[PDB]
């Protein structure tokens, strides 16, 4: 019931997840605990526990040792039944005991999902650090070749560390950017964002997820823009957008497998979409798309009873994210459907669209794996352009809109060269292999090459010519100067390609002062996850003894990995525009304070258990059309400078 004991409990529950628990205390609980024995431990007096126990007793739950997809409606419903129980627990012993009990009864994929979102969305989970999913379920992050070497290492009872190479061949130009969507941390960022902001969320679970639909737009806009920056760095053109009536040019072979369920399916190059039995017809996707664009071009969403909901206003983008994803916040799912989530399944199933071949779900049908597929970025550019029609519909900002009166950016510079490189990172495959009973384990690791960069610090010189210190928001973006054809981009053509590097609030005293901000402190990024082995060691050292470790150290798992803050760029160097906008922090943070702690990842992942701290539209001030660059040049609190990034190859 302390953080050390809770962390250890979670560590134990997630250990060797494909086998019955090996911890005597958890075995005893799974044997003897009755989820219905004392309903006073629940806030709903047992309602959720009754629902799940009835499903269990009627033999209606998915078996153990079976693939699980969050996009599968019934499997999701089953996972959410366990989430609902955990979420109702008043105290930790309820949470732990129900987790231990249902770990041994329910499908492992459902259980892991429910336990993670249960920890994230319950106050009882505060202070717990979830192990990286690439060590809890390594199959979802590790190609089949390396798993086989792990299987071989286990079959032969010999330790080893095995190198993971990217999918494809050098003949496949898309392999040039495999280090983006295949990065294990980028995959954790993506799954964790959706765990923090789930489309199935209903506020009856206990609280509201502030601005979720707009953050849904923004986080995926940033994934798309970041991927395109890697393409530009590797002599590739931007991704095309998907369209339902045109071929998906770039196929994909994941070369990965489920632990149970077989190899992930492949998609050949240059295929037309086919209807997917049990999911949707291609034509249904076109109609859904049309209906969303009808709302955007009408300027209003149509409610279930036909009345209009105005979207010509700052929350319009959020309501659009609600209906596009779609989430349970959608005002009218009967009419607007679920374009984005259904599209994930439509794409994921194109290797077996009629269920003739007994193929498991595609990589697009899991947030753990979706960015590994090149078609992820074609789909999300397509979706991004829907949002962009709405954001482009507003009048361009004026001088008066943008000016922070009395605040001028005199200069922008960086301390330290902008240098990227690849280094090596290891994670454990032990959870992927079968052990027991009464046979000892051996160390089995994967080694991956990952993008990284050297530390740097921004130097932003501002002059506050008001006679008072003022809170300011510093908004930092990296923008392309030229496209892959060497063509110089206008600001209007740059703005939608810019990637967010940082956003922070800082008091600017009167006078001229230099603000320093380290790359490591970015509110866009989070560090590499601590290893499962490290979390066990720290939790065990605390429990066996008694030591209050400041676990309030790790960031969150949602956020672009720190190592991927910068695009790869080129060995010969590339020049980019570093764009800084300094805006009125008093107005931006009204209702959430400026001195308050906002965590390490508020730019795209918000603040755990709090409202979103920045009132401005996501992407401000680049999210509206800029047809006249003179407007931005005339605003003293906006400035961009040219910076150079060099890739250091091996």
Ligand X SMILES: *[C@@H]1O[C@H](CO)[C@@H](O)[C@H](O)[C@H]1NC(C)=O
CB count in 10 Å sphere of residue 575:
12
Out of ligand X, a copy of itself, ligand O, none, what residue 543 binds, judged by CB under 5 to 8 A for its kind, is none
Which string of x and - marks every residue 243-282 that binds a copy of itself (by CB under 8 A)? --------xxx-x-x----xx-xx-xx-x-----------
Cβ atoms 389, 293 nearer than 8 A: yes
Contact of residue 251 among a copy of itself, ligand X, ligand O, none (CB under 5-8 Å per partner type): a copy of itself
Q: Where are the alpha helices (DSSP H) in 302-427?
A: 316-325, 333-336, 339-348, 375-391, 399-402
Please check whether residue 423 is in contact with residue 450, taking contact to mean a CB–CB distance below 8 angstroms.
Answer: yes
* Using rule CB under 8 A, residue 137 touches a copy of itself: no
Contacts of 549 (CB under 8 A, 6+ apart): 3, 4, 538, 541, 542
| Residue nearest to ligand O according to CB distances in the complex | 370
Query: Contacts with a copy of itself in 342-401 (CB under 8 A)?
Result: 351-352, 354-359
Q: How far is the CB of 77 from a copy of itself (least distance, A)?
A: 23
Q: Is 370 in the site for ligand O (CB under 6 A)?
A: yes
Among 43, 157, 163, 313, binds ligand X (CB under 6 A): 163
Q: Which is nearer to a copy of itself, 359 or 414 (CB)?
A: 359
Are 373 and 346 a contacting pair, CB within 8 Å? no
Query: Least distance to ligand O from the beta carbon of 220, Å?
Result: 6
* Backbone phi, psi, residue 372, to 5°: -70, -30
CA nearest 233: which of 570, 642, 646?
Answer: 570
Which residues are CB-contacts of 243 (< 8 A; sequence separation ≥ 6)?
A: 382
Interacting partner of 144 out of a copy of itself, ligand O, ligand X, none (Cβ under 5 to 8 A depending on kind): a copy of itself
With CB under 8 A as the contact rule, the residue among 2, 34, 157, 547 that binds a copy of itself is: 157
Q: Which of 260, 217, 277 is nearest to 69 (CA)?
A: 260
Report the run of H or E that residue 420 belongs to, with start and end. Answer: strand 418-428
Identify the residue among 203, 410, 424, 441 touching ligand X (CB under 6 A). 424
Binding track, positions 329-368, relative to ligand O; x by CB under 6 A: ----------------------------------------
Instruction: Classify residue 184 by its DSSP letter.
Output: H
The nearer residue to ligand O, 212 or 220, going by C-beta atoms, is: 220
CB neighbour list of residue 535: distance below 8 Å, 6 or more residues apart: 7, 11, 129, 131
For 419, the enclosing helix (H) or strand (E) is strand 418-428
Site string (441-480) toward ligand X, x via CB under 6 A? ------x---------------------------------
Ramachandran category for residue 568: left, alpha or beta (phi over 0 → left; psi -120 to 50 → alpha)? alpha
- Choose the contact partner of 163 out of a copy of itself, ligand O, ligand X, none; CB within 5 to 8 A by kind: ligand X
Residue 16 CA to residue 430 CA, distance in Å, equals: 8
Closer of 270 and 334 to a copy of itself (Cβ): 270
The C-alpha atoms of residue 185 and residue 559 are separated, in whole angstroms, by: 9
Q: What is the smallest separation between the CB atom of 424 and ligand X, expressed in angstroms? A: 5
577 binds a copy of itself (CB under 8 A): no
| Cα–Cα distances in angstroms (integers) from residue 532 to residues 110, 241, 367, in the given order | 20, 38, 20
Cβ 216 to ligand O shortest distance, Å:
7
Residues found near ligand X in the complex (CB under 6 A): 163, 424, 447
- Binding residues (CB under 8 A) for a copy of itself: these are 144-145, 151-152, 154-157, 167-169, 171-172, 251-253, 255, 257, 262-263, 265-266, 268-269, 271, 351-352, 354-359, 433-437, 439
Binding site for ligand O (CB under 6 A): 220, 370
């Amino acid at each position: 019931s302390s953080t050390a004991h809770k962390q250890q409990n979670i560590n134990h529950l997630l250990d060797k997840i494909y086998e019955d628990t090996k911890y005597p205390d958890l075995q005893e609980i799974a044997k003897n605990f009755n989820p219905l024995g004392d309903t006073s431990m629940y806030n709903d007096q047992g309602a959720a526990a009754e629902v799940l126990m009835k499903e269990l007793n009627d033999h209606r739950l998915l078996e153990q040792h079976h693939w699980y997809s969050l996009f599968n409606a019934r499997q999701r419903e089953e996972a959410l039944m366990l989430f609902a129980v955990l979420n109702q627990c008043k105290v930790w012993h309820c949470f732990r005991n129900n987790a231990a009990y249902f770990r041994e009864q329910m499908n492992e994929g459902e259980f892991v999902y429910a336990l993670y979102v249960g920890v994230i969305h319950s106050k009882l989970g505060d202070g717990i650090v979830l192990p990286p999913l690439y060590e809890i379920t390594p199959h979802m992050f590790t190609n089949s070749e390396v798993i086989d070497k792990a299987y071989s290492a286990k079959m032969t009872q010999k330790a080893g560390t095995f190198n993971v190479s990217f999918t494809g061949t050098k003949k496949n130009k898309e392999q040039r950017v495999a280090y983006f969507g295949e990065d294990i941390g980028m995959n954790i960022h993506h799954v964790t964002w959706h765990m923090d902001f789930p489309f199935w969320w209903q506020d009856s679970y206990g609280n509201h997820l502030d601005r979720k639909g707009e953050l849904f737009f923004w986080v995926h806009h940033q994934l798309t823009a970041r991927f395109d920056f890697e393409r530009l760095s590797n002599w590739l053109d931007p991704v095309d957008e998907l369209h339902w009536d045109r071929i998906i040019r770039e196929g994909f072979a994941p070369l990965t497998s489920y632990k149970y369920g077989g190899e992930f399916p492949v998609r050949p190059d240059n295929i037309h979409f086919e209807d997917v039995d049990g999911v949707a017809h291609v034509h249904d996707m076109e109609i859904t798309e049309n209906r969303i664009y009808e709302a955007i071009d009408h300027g209003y969403i149509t409610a279930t009873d036909g009345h209009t909901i105005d979207i010509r206003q700052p929350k319009g983008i959020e309501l659009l994210g609600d209906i596009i994803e779609s989430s349970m916040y959608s005002p009218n799912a009967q009419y607007y459907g679920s374009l984005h989530n259904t599209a994930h399944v439509m794409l994921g199933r194109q290797g077996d669209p009629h269920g003739k071949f007994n193929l498991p779900p595609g990589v697009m049908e899991h947030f753990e794996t979706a960015t590994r597929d090149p078609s992820f970025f074609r789909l999300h550019k397509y979706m991004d352009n829907i949002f962009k029609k709405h954001t482009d519909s507003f009048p361009p900002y004026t001088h008066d809109d943008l000016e922070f009166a009395g605040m001028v950016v005199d200069g922008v510079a960086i301390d330290g060269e902008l240098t990227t490189f690849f280094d090596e990172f290891q994670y454990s495959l032990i959870n992927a292999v079968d052990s027991g009973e009464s046979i000892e384990d051996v160390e089995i690791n994967a080694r991956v090459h990952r993008l990284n960069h050297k530390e740097f610090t921004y130097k932003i010189t501002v002059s506050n010519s008001i006679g008072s210190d003022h809170l300011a928001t510093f908004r930092i973006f990296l923008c392309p100067i030229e496209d892959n054809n060497g063509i110089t981009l206008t600001l209007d053509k740059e703005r939608w390609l810019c990637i967010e590097l940082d956003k922070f609030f800082q008091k600017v005293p009167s006078g001229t002062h230099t603000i320093h901000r380290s790359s490591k402190d970015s509110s866009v990024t989070v560090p590499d996850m601590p290893s499962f082995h490290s979390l066990k060691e720290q939790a065990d050292n605390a429990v066996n003894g008694g030591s209050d470790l400041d676990l309030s150290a790790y960031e969150r798992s949602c956020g672009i990995p720190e190592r991927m803050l910068l695009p790869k760029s080129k060995p010969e160097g590339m020049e980019f525009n570093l764009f800084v906008a300094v805006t009125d922090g008093v107005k931006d943070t009204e209702g959430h304070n400026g001195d308050h702690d906002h965590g390490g990842t508020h730019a795209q992942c918000g603040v755990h258990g709090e409202a979103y701290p920045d009132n401005r539209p996501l992407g401000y001030p680049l999210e509206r059309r800029i047809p006249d660059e003179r407007v931005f040049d005339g605003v003293p609190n906006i400035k961009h400078v040219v910076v150079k990034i060099v890739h250091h190859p091996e």
